[PDB]
Amino acid sequence: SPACAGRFQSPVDIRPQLAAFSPALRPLELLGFQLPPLPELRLRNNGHSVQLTLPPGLEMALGPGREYRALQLHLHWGAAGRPGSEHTVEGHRFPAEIHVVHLSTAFARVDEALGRPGGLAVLAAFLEEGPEENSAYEQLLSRLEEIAEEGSETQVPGLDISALLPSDFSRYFQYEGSLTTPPCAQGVIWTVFQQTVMLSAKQLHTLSDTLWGPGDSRLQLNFRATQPLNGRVIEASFP
Amino acid sequence: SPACAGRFQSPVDIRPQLAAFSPALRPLELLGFQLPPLPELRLRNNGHSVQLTLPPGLEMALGPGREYRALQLHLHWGAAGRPGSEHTVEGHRFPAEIHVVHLSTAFARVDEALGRPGGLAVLAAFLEEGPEENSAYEQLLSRLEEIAEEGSETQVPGLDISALLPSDFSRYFQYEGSLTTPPCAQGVIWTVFQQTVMLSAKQLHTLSDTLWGPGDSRLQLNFRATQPLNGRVIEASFP
Ligand SMILES: CS(=O)(=O)c1c(N[C@H]2CC[C@@H](O)CC2)c(F)c(S(N)(=O)=O)c(F)c1N[C@H]1CC[C@@H](O)CC1
Ligand SMILES: CS(=O)(=O)c1c(N[C@H]2CC[C@H](O)CC2)c(F)c(S(N)(=O)=O)c(F)c1N[C@H]1CC[C@@H](O)CC1
Ligand SMILES: [Zn+2]
Ligand SMILES: [Zn+2]
């Protein structure tokens, strides 16, 4: 895919000292993320990541008049004693990263949004080790064994999707970039939370050690190398 | 259209003390705007404004990878002793306003771009009274009497469109709003130059007094009322 050779790709190394403070960046707003248990959602090992397909009615705004609907979420992760976030901060790679991918309400389908400015928006948070079992994450992680095989899927009860994200929606970096998988189309608005989410050591081990990918290989280290900013300026919602 | 009653319409009152400075807003880039004398350009009285069709090749960027092509320019103006700008600054209405309308390179057609975020971008500058005659604007103003009649049109020599704009391309306000005429589509990026351009009192009179609209009416005061921000924050490219 030729867009994988674009000048403005993701992910990137975030250098907060070079980030631009912009007070137009208000707290993110999420609506409908607190799901009932039924209907169930589909959790799939696609051989490259674990992805959770989201139902209609999850609305996200980056600001007034900047409205999106959530499509899916997926994870990026490393391996035993090796971090696997996609984004880095000052060259630091975090253990894992969650991405929640959204479609602008001006478009009915992803294929019309691809490459259009602000057509797609991704919410990204780093996952780090904390002392406690994260109960929202446990609902997904406890099902990975069921989908160990490449191309397998299982149904899971609806949960509070917003509980997979940090509680602080006010402090984030934002920049324009790309999908990180072919076709790497540009125009994607990336939002990366400052606050991280905490999983237990056991949870992080389940995530990195359970799933299999193409041809008898463990699905691990499933992150793209850092791409140059190439003159883009990362914005921050805080000085 | 009911879209004229949408929440994120244009024009607006700019309040510079409430604008958000974002250092990410780089100088505008306008290439290919210095047109040769041939081919000639269509200038047209549509009954609502005077419009100049622009050729292919006028490239405009609002930031890295956010590129546009100019389609047309048109003007908004008052009457004798009555200002007719669309935007206001702290309640002050300027004598007139120029709009240069552009299409995102991510969209092949205007009709696909209408209602999509960033599909269209308009460059807007205030016209004020100064002591000198303005050479750039004379090229257009001297041609108005030939098209005084609703629906009439004429061909004009190519001109340097960029010469119609203010001096410092690094100093502007920017927000997302709408077309200021039906269909009032949202998702339009408005960039409003901080500095103005100056015309003579005679030129201003030529602009406001020469053209005829529907009925046997003068074509005057062709500006929409100020619309609420509804929580939108206007950005500024300077502290
Ligand atoms: C196809 S996908 O859901 O897994 C996907 C990924 N997956 C990558 C995991 C790690 C890599 O080693 C290979 C594949 C991804 F990273 C982005 S990302 N990081 O750009 O957000 C995605 F958006 C989607 N899915 C997209 C969005 C839905 C749309 O239909 C196109 C594909
Ligand atoms: C009627 S018009 O074309 O002169 C016009 C345009 N042109 C657009 C029309 C819709 C799109 O399909 C292509 C571009 C425009 F962009 C704005 S604006 N301000 O939104 O940029 C206008 F105000 C006017 N004309 C108006 C008509 C009513 C009159 O009172 C003021 C001028
Ligand atoms: Zn991803
Ligand atoms: Zn206009």
mmCIF file of N, CA, C and O and ligand atoms in Angstrom, chain A residues 46 48-49 51 72 74 76 86 99 101 110 122 179-181 190 222, ligand 1:
data_model
loop_
_atom_site.group_PDB
_atom_site.id
_atom_site.type_symbol
_atom_site.label_atom_id
_atom_site.label_comp_id
_atom_site.label_asym_id
_atom_site.label_seq_id
_atom_site.Cartn_x
_atom_site.Cartn_y
_atom_site.Cartn_z
ATOM 1 N N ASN A 46 -7.134 -11.701 15.265
ATOM 2 C CA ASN A 46 -7.045 -11.573 13.820
ATOM 3 C C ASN A 46 -5.634 -11.925 13.354
ATOM 4 O O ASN A 46 -5.286 -11.663 12.212
ATOM 5 N N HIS A 48 -2.922 -10.488 14.108
ATOM 6 C CA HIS A 48 -2.052 -9.315 14.225
ATOM 7 C C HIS A 48 -2.297 -8.584 15.554
ATOM 8 O O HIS A 48 -1.435 -7.857 16.026
ATOM 9 N N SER A 49 -3.496 -8.742 16.121
ATOM 10 C CA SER A 49 -3.914 -8.086 17.355
ATOM 11 C C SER A 49 -5.150 -8.812 17.880
ATOM 12 O O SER A 49 -5.662 -9.710 17.204
ATOM 13 N N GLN A 51 -8.957 -7.820 18.798
ATOM 14 C CA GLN A 51 -9.852 -6.719 18.526
ATOM 15 C C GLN A 51 -11.250 -7.000 19.053
ATOM 16 O O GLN A 51 -11.769 -8.094 18.897
ATOM 17 N N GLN A 72 -14.359 0.013 16.868
ATOM 18 C CA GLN A 72 -13.654 -1.121 17.467
ATOM 19 C C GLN A 72 -12.512 -0.615 18.342
ATOM 20 O O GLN A 72 -12.103 0.549 18.252
ATOM 21 N N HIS A 74 -8.558 -2.330 19.900
ATOM 22 C CA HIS A 74 -7.571 -3.383 19.822
ATOM 23 C C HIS A 74 -6.362 -2.961 20.638
ATOM 24 O O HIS A 74 -6.264 -1.799 21.025
ATOM 25 N N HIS A 76 -1.927 -3.287 21.447
ATOM 26 C CA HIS A 76 -0.572 -3.552 21.009
ATOM 27 C C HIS A 76 0.271 -3.822 22.264
ATOM 28 O O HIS A 76 0.048 -3.214 23.300
ATOM 29 N N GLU A 86 2.949 1.397 20.822
ATOM 30 C CA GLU A 86 3.282 1.942 19.511
ATOM 31 C C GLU A 86 3.896 3.325 19.676
ATOM 32 O O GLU A 86 4.974 3.594 19.158
ATOM 33 N N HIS A 99 -6.013 1.087 21.523
ATOM 34 C CA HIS A 99 -6.475 2.001 20.483
ATOM 35 C C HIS A 99 -7.980 1.815 20.294
ATOM 36 O O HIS A 99 -8.427 0.688 20.085
ATOM 37 N N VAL A 101 -10.847 3.072 17.793
ATOM 38 C CA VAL A 101 -10.911 3.658 16.455
ATOM 39 C C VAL A 101 -12.339 4.114 16.199
ATOM 40 O O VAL A 101 -13.281 3.333 16.447
ATOM 41 N N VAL A 110 -16.221 3.549 6.583
ATOM 42 C CA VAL A 110 -14.789 3.735 6.667
ATOM 43 C C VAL A 110 -14.154 4.023 5.307
ATOM 44 O O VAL A 110 -13.296 4.891 5.186
ATOM 45 N N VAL A 122 -8.518 8.203 16.454
ATOM 46 C CA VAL A 122 -8.155 7.116 17.333
ATOM 47 C C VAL A 122 -7.866 7.705 18.716
ATOM 48 O O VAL A 122 -7.192 8.747 18.809
ATOM 49 N N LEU A 179 -3.254 5.484 9.914
ATOM 50 C CA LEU A 179 -3.374 4.121 10.361
ATOM 51 C C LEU A 179 -1.974 3.523 10.336
ATOM 52 O O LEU A 179 -1.116 4.009 9.584
ATOM 53 N N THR A 180 -1.751 2.540 11.220
ATOM 54 C CA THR A 180 -0.440 1.940 11.448
ATOM 55 C C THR A 180 -0.413 0.543 10.845
ATOM 56 O O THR A 180 0.496 -0.226 11.125
ATOM 57 N N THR A 181 -1.411 0.239 10.027
ATOM 58 C CA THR A 181 -1.502 -1.036 9.363
ATOM 59 C C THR A 181 -1.917 -0.703 7.941
ATOM 60 O O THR A 181 -2.572 0.314 7.755
ATOM 61 N N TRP A 190 -5.084 11.483 15.936
ATOM 62 C CA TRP A 190 -4.602 10.676 17.047
ATOM 63 C C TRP A 190 -4.654 11.505 18.314
ATOM 64 O O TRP A 190 -4.101 12.618 18.320
ATOM 65 N N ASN A 222 3.728 -6.631 18.529
ATOM 66 C CA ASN A 222 2.888 -6.275 17.402
ATOM 67 C C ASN A 222 2.712 -4.747 17.350
ATOM 68 O O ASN A 222 1.587 -4.254 17.447
HETATM 69 C C1 LIG C 1 -6.954 -4.797 11.312
HETATM 70 S S1 LIG C 1 -6.813 -4.305 12.915
HETATM 71 O O1 LIG C 1 -8.066 -4.282 13.637
HETATM 72 O O2 LIG C 1 -6.075 -5.241 13.733
HETATM 73 C C2 LIG C 1 -6.208 -2.821 13.115
HETATM 74 C C3 LIG C 1 -4.800 -2.709 13.656
HETATM 75 N N1 LIG C 1 -4.067 -3.879 13.793
HETATM 76 C C4 LIG C 1 -2.600 -4.000 13.746
HETATM 77 C C5 LIG C 1 -2.004 -4.649 14.991
HETATM 78 C C6 LIG C 1 -0.474 -4.568 15.011
HETATM 79 C C7 LIG C 1 0.241 -4.707 13.666
HETATM 80 O O3 LIG C 1 1.340 -5.599 13.893
HETATM 81 C C8 LIG C 1 -0.626 -5.184 12.474
HETATM 82 C C9 LIG C 1 -2.147 -4.865 12.544
HETATM 83 C C10 LIG C 1 -4.255 -1.326 13.897
HETATM 84 F F1 LIG C 1 -3.035 -1.126 14.379
HETATM 85 C C11 LIG C 1 -5.056 -0.103 13.642
HETATM 86 S S2 LIG C 1 -4.502 1.367 13.997
HETATM 87 N N2 LIG C 1 -3.197 1.215 15.045
HETATM 88 O O4 LIG C 1 -4.124 2.158 12.865
HETATM 89 O O5 LIG C 1 -5.413 2.009 14.935
HETATM 90 C C12 LIG C 1 -6.441 -0.242 13.171
HETATM 91 F F2 LIG C 1 -7.116 0.890 12.954
HETATM 92 C C13 LIG C 1 -7.044 -1.570 12.924
HETATM 93 N N3 LIG C 1 -8.257 -1.563 12.305
HETATM 94 C C14 LIG C 1 -8.566 -0.493 11.303
HETATM 95 C C15 LIG C 1 -9.802 0.356 11.641
HETATM 96 C C16 LIG C 1 -11.073 -0.287 11.129
HETATM 97 C C17 LIG C 1 -11.017 -0.070 9.624
HETATM 98 O O6 LIG C 1 -11.933 -0.975 9.018
HETATM 99 C C18 LIG C 1 -9.624 -0.277 9.002
HETATM 100 C C19 LIG C 1 -8.693 -1.101 9.899
#
